[PDB]
Every structure is written in C-alpha cells, then in structure tokens.
Design an enzyme around this catalytic site. Structure first.
Site, PDB file in Angstrom:
ATOM      1  N   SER B  50       0.817  -1.325   0.033  1.00 23.91           N
ATOM      2  CA  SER B  50       0.065   0.085  -0.023  1.00 23.91           C
ATOM      3  C   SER B  50       0.811   1.190   0.022  1.00 23.91           C
ATOM      4  O   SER B  50       0.365   2.336  -0.200  1.00 23.91           O
ATOM      5  CB  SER B  50      -0.762   0.058   1.198  1.00 23.91           C
ATOM      6  OG  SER B  50      -2.026  -1.038   1.051  1.00 23.91           O
ATOM      7  N   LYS B  53       0.503   3.347  -3.071  1.00 27.63           N
ATOM      8  CA  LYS B  53      -0.593   4.404  -3.226  1.00 27.63           C
ATOM      9  C   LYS B  53       0.159   5.827  -3.487  1.00 27.63           C
ATOM     10  O   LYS B  53      -0.717   6.689  -4.058  1.00 27.63           O
ATOM     11  CB  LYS B  53      -1.521   4.751  -2.085  1.00 27.63           C
ATOM     12  CG  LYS B  53      -2.247   3.216  -2.098  1.00 27.63           C
ATOM     13  CD  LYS B  53      -3.370   3.231  -1.084  1.00 27.63           C
ATOM     14  CE  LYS B  53      -4.451   2.406  -1.140  1.00 27.63           C
ATOM     15  NZ  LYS B  53      -4.079   1.066  -0.398  1.00 27.63           N
ATOM     16  N   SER B  98      -6.682   3.453   2.878  1.00 27.25           N
ATOM     17  CA  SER B  98      -5.874   3.013   1.803  1.00 27.25           C
ATOM     18  C   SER B  98      -6.809   1.821   1.503  1.00 27.25           C
ATOM     19  O   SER B  98      -6.689   0.640   1.420  1.00 27.25           O
ATOM     20  CB  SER B  98      -5.114   1.830   2.875  1.00 27.25           C
ATOM     21  OG  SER B  98      -3.753   1.369   2.370  1.00 27.25           O
ATOM     22  N   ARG B 230       4.222  -0.463  13.673  1.00 30.55           N
ATOM     23  CA  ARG B 230       4.922   0.175  12.377  1.00 30.55           C
ATOM     24  C   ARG B 230       5.206   1.454  12.969  1.00 30.55           C
ATOM     25  O   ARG B 230       6.138   1.853  13.079  1.00 30.55           O
ATOM     26  CB  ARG B 230       4.378   0.076  10.948  1.00 30.55           C
ATOM     27  CG  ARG B 230       4.137  -1.317  10.697  1.00 30.55           C
ATOM     28  CD  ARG B 230       3.157  -1.539   9.311  1.00 30.55           C
ATOM     29  NE  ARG B 230       1.635  -0.858   9.843  1.00 30.55           N
ATOM     30  CZ  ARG B 230       0.764  -0.648   8.964  1.00 30.55           C
ATOM     31  NH1 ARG B 230       0.621  -1.110   7.756  1.00 30.55           N
ATOM     32  NH2 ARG B 230      -0.618  -0.377   9.461  1.00 30.55           N
TER      33      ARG B 230
HETATM   34  C1  LIG Z   1      -1.909  -2.352   1.536  1.00 31.06           C
HETATM   35  O1  LIG Z   1      -0.623  -2.415   2.047  1.00 31.06           O
HETATM   36  N1  LIG Z   1      -2.676  -3.047   1.764  1.00 31.06           N
HETATM   37  C2  LIG Z   1      -4.214  -2.377   1.727  1.00 31.06           C
HETATM   38  C3  LIG Z   1      -4.381  -1.853   3.509  1.00 31.06           C
HETATM   39  N2  LIG Z   1      -3.434  -0.989   3.983  1.00 31.06           N
HETATM   40  O2  LIG Z   1      -3.785  -0.692   5.214  1.00 31.06           O
HETATM   41  S1  LIG Z   1      -2.135  -0.397   5.842  1.00 31.06           S
HETATM   42  O3  LIG Z   1      -1.576  -1.659   5.892  1.00 31.06           O
HETATM   43  O4  LIG Z   1      -2.459  -0.033   7.360  1.00 31.06           O
HETATM   44  O5  LIG Z   1      -1.589   0.918   4.984  1.00 31.06           O
HETATM   45  C4  LIG Z   1      -4.548  -3.100   4.438  1.00 31.06           C
HETATM   46  C5  LIG Z   1      -3.186  -4.135   4.290  1.00 31.06           C
HETATM   47  C6  LIG Z   1      -2.827  -4.301   2.593  1.00 31.06           C
HETATM   48  C7  LIG Z   1      -3.555  -5.259   1.687  1.00 31.06           C
HETATM   49  O6  LIG Z   1      -3.807  -6.199   2.569  1.00 31.06           O
HETATM   50  N3  LIG Z   1      -3.488  -5.208   0.378  1.00 31.06           N
HETATM   51  O7  LIG Z   1      -3.898  -6.521  -0.270  1.00 31.06           O
HETATM   52  C8  LIG Z   1      -5.134  -6.134  -0.920  1.00 31.06           C
HETATM   53  C9  LIG Z   1      -6.472  -6.291   0.082  1.00 31.06           C
HETATM   54  N4  LIG Z   1      -6.063  -7.525   1.270  1.00 31.06           N
HETATM   55 CL   LIG Z   2      -2.597  -0.285  -2.669  1.00 34.50          CL
END
Ligand SMILES: *C(=O)N1C[C@H](NOS(=O)(=O)O)CC[C@H]1C(=O)NOCCN
Ligand SMILES: [Cl-]
Ligand SMILES: *C(=O)N1C[C@H](NOS(=O)(=O)O)CC[C@H]1C(=O)NOCCN
Ligand SMILES: [Cl-]
Ligand SMILES: [Cl-]
Lengths: 245, 245
Positions: B50, B53, B98, B230
């Site tokens: 992510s 982004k 996100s 993190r």
């Molecule tokens: C990106 O890292 N993503 C989307 C979302 N981001 O939240 S963060 O980690 O707090 O920025 C959740 C984790 C991660 C994913 O899981 N993306 O994959 C697609 C959805 N599972």
């Molecule tokens: Cl993403």
C-alpha cells in the site's frame, strides 16, 4: 423551509463559563447552512489583524514576492518583544509564529496598487487598504466580519479565489494547525490590539471524512491573558455539536 | 571525513522489546546524513504494497484519471472485509483508509505502458511492473528498498518528481497523518501479505520548524495484529533521537 442561517444561543454558555463575550460562526459545507450564537455580531466587521496573513500570503505567492513555502526571510536584526520573531523564517514558520515583520515586508513588496486590486478580486471585507500598506490590517481602515471570513475561506478551500491554484494550495498547507485520525484543522489566529474594541480571532475550518465545517470566531480580548480562549471556546462549541470528539 | 550513512544498533532494542525484527532508516535533510539500525536490510528490496498508493496517486492525477482530491469514487456495492472500504471515497479518504479497490481502478485506467513509463521516470525502485496491472505492487515484480523509498520521498518533498507540481502537492496533502505544534508527519503505511516475507511498512517524513527527517521502516509482520508496531517502533526511535518529544 430551512434557513441559511440559524442561531444557537446555547453556545453562549461557553462564553459565559469563561467570563467572555463574542461570537462563533459555523458553516456546514455539505448542508450549505450556517449556525451562530449571535447573528448580529457574526456580521460585525472588525480589523482582521493577524488573520490577514492568509490573503497576504496568497498575494505574495502569486506575485512572486515569495517563491515558495521554504524560501527564507532573514531576521532584520531588530530585537522585538516576541522571542520567536527574532529569527529567520519561511512562510510556514512565519504563519505559525505569526511573525508580523515578515508579513509587513511581504506587503511592502506587494505595494498598495497591487494589494488593493487583489483584495477587490478576493471580495475581501470592505476592501479598504487606507493607511500604510504594511499596517492597514492592524491599525487602518480594512474591516471584515466573521461571515465574510467564512465566505473568503470557502473560496480558498475550493481553489476559487482569483489567484493561482498553486498559491491557494501553499497557503492551505501553511494554515495547518492540527491533524489526527479524527479531523484536520486549518486556521489562523489573530489579536487586534491597536483600535478599540480589542478582539481575538480564530478563523479556518475542520476537515472530516465526509464534510467540512468552516468556522470564524471573535471575542472581546482586553488582555493577552485570555488568548487561549479563542481556540478553547471554539472547540467547546465543536465538541457540543459532535464535530470533534 | 564524516560518514554519509551510519549504523545505530541501539535501535534494535525497540524491535526486541516488541518481539519484532526490521529496519528503521532516517535521513536528516539539513545534515545530508542517514542513520539506520541495519544497513543491509535498509537496502533490501521488498514489495511496496500500500505504500505504492503514493506513486499511483501521482500518476493518476497527472494523467487526468483523477481530476482532483475531492472527486468522489462511488462504492461499487461489493461488501468487502474492511468496513471503511464499503463507502464512497475521494483521494484523501482513499489514501487514509488505504482503499485498495479504488487504487486498482486507477491502475487499470493508467494501463501497463503508462504505468511502466512513469515508474521509470520516477526512478521508482526496480521500475518493474511485471504481473497484473492492478496488483503488481502486491504480488508482481516491483521491488523497492527503504533507502529507495527515502530517495523517492525526497524528490516528492522537493517537487522534483517527473509529474506536475500540482500532483505532488495534492499527494503530499493526502499523506498528512498527524500534526501538532511540535511536528507534522506525512506518511503512508503498507502491509505486504501475498509474497514472503510478509512485512509492514511506514514511509514518510517528519517536518520540524527548521529541519525535516525522512523515514522508511519495514518489519516482519506475520499477523495484522502487529500492525500498530509500525508507527510505535518508528516513534520510539524518533523519541530516542529527540526528533519528537
Ligand atoms: C496495503 O498495504 N494494503 C491495503 C490496506 N493497507 O492498510 S495499511 O497496511 O494500514 O496501510 C491493508 C493491508 C494491505 C492489503 O492487504 N492489501 O492487499 C489487498 C487487500 N488484502
Ligand atoms: Cl494499494
Ligand atoms: C496578529 O494578530 N498579531 C501578531 C501575533 N499574532 O499572534 S496570534 O494572535 O496568536 O495569532 C500577536 C498578536 C497580533 C499583534 O500583536 N500584531 O501587532 C500589533 C497589532 N495587533
Ligand atoms: Cl500580520
Ligand atoms: Cl497539508
């Protein structure tokens, strides 16, 4: 049917609780409706004092007086009464520490003809710059009401002022006051001390996930000891209205 | 002669205290010096997940896929596991929550040829978009190290990336994470979950009155229960170094 402006007199309790008098004006952007404890004082025009740093910044940037938000404006070496003013600044820190001498230099370089023209283009208050080009917002003829502050800020928020989008984005960055997962506040304080009645200002907006609440407040301010009440009373209203936690 | 990159292994205690392993990388912009607990892992390349982004937003804006940061992307009606995704979004809230499906649509509109061209123009990581146009940053061939994240972020901070200044300012606004009188954090989290090793990211910078500290961290992340580490481990390092109180 629904009105553009409504009075909420219960907010007076937050002034009374702090032995203060003044006005808070809120504007709900999604609903296109405004709310205030005193609709007459909401439309009363006062010297903007340091809240003028917002249009001053915009004009200085668009004319190239200020190249960007990191260009340094060195201290002129005159020791002034506020310690944070006796140092070098950029646009961000000059707004944060409300460094009047830096913004007076901006205004002198803008010059009266361009300052007048741009405040007319901005529809800003009574548009009157009579006095010194580097002090009219402190002790000259310009006057702006809380509702006129909201009008100006709404144009800035939407990048609809008659200056470049770039200048508007830079100034909105410089207005950043507080941010957490619940909200962002972009705002500017001021204290008009030279012409009676002495008043404190806080103008800006609160960004939520799905809405924006513009605000403009002023209050009688006989001494600087009460300056923290500008934000405290405003936040008490924002809390009562469930806009912030 | 002083060292551009220095290792501070004492930061490992913050990882060990939280039963974790990873790297924090800091760059002191005024001093032009970098600091890390693990010089090798600082330069190892991982899926950005992510944190992609940030470049995806820049490209979508500069290509006109996204008109501005208030354009609304309507929920497609599919009920996904993360409740905040089952909502209408704009660019600001899509970055904050996100919202992967919104960014997958951006990527599909951009398309493979333009995505590849723009990542090469950005010097972004290994510049390799092999895999699916709408998932290569999650399970395809793109890789970026923590030091490369800093290099990319420094270009963004200085408006030096090969996209309009406007797009860079919009994305820096969307990255706003926290602000108080002591500092501003602009940053993006990520969690690479599909290819081993699963890692959490936090990349961005801390603005002070007179300096900016860029940071990029990643850490092993077997479970989403540890994602708060993190920011916590990064902030423990920033506190140890007296960057934040
Ligand atoms: C990106 O890292 N993503 C989307 C979302 N981001 O939240 S963060 O980690 O707090 O920025 C959740 C984790 C991660 C994913 O899981 N993306 O994959 C697609 C959805 N599972
Ligand atoms: Cl993403
Ligand atoms: C502007 O209103 N200023 C500058 C500075 N602002 O601090 S704030 O009110 O917290 O934004 C101090 C008060 C005020 C002045 O003292 N300006 O010079 C004299 C005219 N009031
Ligand atoms: Cl001023
Ligand atoms: Cl911002």
């Amino acid at each position: 049917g629904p009105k553009e402006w409504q009075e909420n007199k219960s907010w007076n309790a937050h002034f009374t609780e702090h032995k203060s008098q003044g006005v808070v004006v809120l504007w709900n952007e999604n609903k296109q409706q405004g709310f205030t404890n005193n609709l007459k004082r909401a439309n009363q025009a006062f010297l903007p004092a340091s809240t003028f740093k917002i249009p001053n910044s915009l004009i200085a940037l668009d004319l190239g007086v200020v190249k960007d938000e990191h260009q340094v404006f060195k201290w002129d070496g005159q020791t002034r009464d506020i310690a944070t003013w006796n140092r070098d600044h950029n646009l961000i820190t000059a707004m944060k520490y409300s460094v009047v001498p830096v913004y007076q230099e901006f205004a002198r370089q803008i010059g009266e003809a361009r300052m007048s023209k741009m405040l007319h283009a901005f529809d800003y208050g009574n548009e009157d710059i009579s006095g010194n080009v580097d002090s009219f917002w402190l002790d000259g003829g310009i006057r702006i009401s809380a509702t006129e502050q909201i009008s100006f800020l709404r144009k800035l928020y939407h990048n609809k002022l008659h200056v470049s989008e770039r200048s508007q984005r830079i100034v909105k960055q410089a207005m950043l006051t507080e941010a957490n997962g619940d909200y962002i506040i972009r705002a500017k304080t001021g204290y008009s001390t030279r012409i009676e009645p002495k008043i404190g200002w806080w103008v800006g907006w609160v960004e939520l996930d799905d809405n924006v609440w513009f605000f403009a407040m002023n209050m009688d301010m006989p001494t600087s000891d009460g300056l923290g009440l500008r934000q405290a009373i405003t936040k008490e209203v924002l809390k009562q209205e469930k806009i912030i936690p």
